[PDB]
Amino acid sequence: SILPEEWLPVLEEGEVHFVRIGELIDRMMEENAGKVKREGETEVLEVSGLEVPSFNRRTNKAELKRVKALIRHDYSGKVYTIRLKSGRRIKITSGHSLFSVRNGELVEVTGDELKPGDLVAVPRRLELPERNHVLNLVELLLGTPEEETLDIVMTIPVKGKKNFFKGMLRTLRWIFGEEKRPRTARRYLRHLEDLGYVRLKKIGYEVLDWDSLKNYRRLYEALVENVRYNGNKREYLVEFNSIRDAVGIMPLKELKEWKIGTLNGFRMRKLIEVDESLAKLLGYYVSEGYARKQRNPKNGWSYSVKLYNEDPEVLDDMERLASRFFGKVRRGRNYVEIPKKIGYLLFENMCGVLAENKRIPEFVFTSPKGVRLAFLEGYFIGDGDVHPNKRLRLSTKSELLANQLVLLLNSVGVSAVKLGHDSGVYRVYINEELPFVKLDKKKNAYYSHVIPKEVLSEVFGKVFQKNVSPQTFRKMVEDGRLDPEKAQRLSWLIEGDVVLDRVESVDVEDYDGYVYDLSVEDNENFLVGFGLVYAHN
16 A cells, blocks of 8 residues: 555546645545445545556556546555655555566565565656647636735727626526516527527527526626726726626636736736747746735735846747737846736746745646647756756755656656755756757666666576666667567567666655555556656555
8 A cells, every 4th residue: 555645646637636645535535425435444435537647567558547446444564665766765555566577577566575676667758648728817816815816807898898798687687587678688699599598599589507597697797796997998897806706607708808917007818728838938937937026116016927047048038938928028137027917826826936836837747748848948948957968957845846847757758867855955867868958868877778787687598798778779689689589578678668767775664544545447557656656556
């Protein structure tokens, strides 16, 4: 079984989240108490909607799988913290199995069996889904403290909507039988049909969804009561907070027409399509971005976002990207500033404010590779890791970020990764080429670009000078240096999506508490631990 605090990458409805397995399993069981069957000390809760990354037991390739159930045993015994030479770490009970090698094949080795030196399976790359994402600033802000969206408003041109609100309400009230049929009735009944609520008929109409109409009415009731007119710009206005408890009802069809921001400041389009510029912009922020709130004039609240960097070229690119989504921007000595409330809000909720809370936005993990790489590039460049003379060294105070980076890298084919945490800081080391950074993996190679000599030794019965890269392995096969028939025993290691990391230390403790586990469809395994480690379900 896995311990409570162990991180676990999971996918829900197509999105990737990092959760502490205990928190996930405890929360689920509490909200589904009834369905939780129990056989003494064990508690099993079948579920759907969850998916975890695993590897095919036969081909060993990366593939996502359904999580059949969540399990919880009350445990009293020994727990082992397994530390890999790569930096990965995983704490498990004595009978939990991880994957090691025995005679060229992947076998299971229990926690109470693992010793320093043993080879442990770990990801070479991951196969996460790919889709285009669309940000929704409304939902985003609805997840924000009202005290932070005080000056936020939602404007809309008065053009085609001459008194639309009060006019729609009247039709609704009429629909609910509280008024005589309005004069502009059909101009609205169509819109409703367009939204799917009503079925316009030759003669009158037929209400399709009362419950929905009720919320829609509730929405317009809120609009009429709060929408003001701004003679100045000829548009309708609404203070966000005044309709927070209803705006979420606004159908997307209608949302498109609105804008959101401040009255005398930057106004944004509510629905944003995630593209590479945005991702790379966010990358810049996650690494070198600082969001501030200083008091100013009437002591208390001018918001801004600065993107630091000591090199002109970079600052030029940030300035280019920042202004690409937030209009006019301010250049500085060593930074680029976006002094806009809604930009500040967007970045705050997307990536976090404090360094130790910085994080990769969720949509990045399952976006097309072009976008994942765009983010990574914005992050690396900003962090100043584009001109290396050896392996890169990324530092963060956010352990979430460290884990996310590792998963994001794996998802784009980078496997030569290492970890560390030394003094309130997490480090992610990378020793292999990236489309935007040249690095020689052959030089001081990492475990991922090497076939353990014990494995070769065992499989081929020969004794090997040193370690061979998978590249030099394929070659030795093609010109008889390696027996091709024996060599096939390792096709899973050369052809699969797994590499062998090695146990450095093992710590044993006595534990009294809840331990967890999962049941994974088909493969019966999943990723857990700091840095991601394959564990048998």
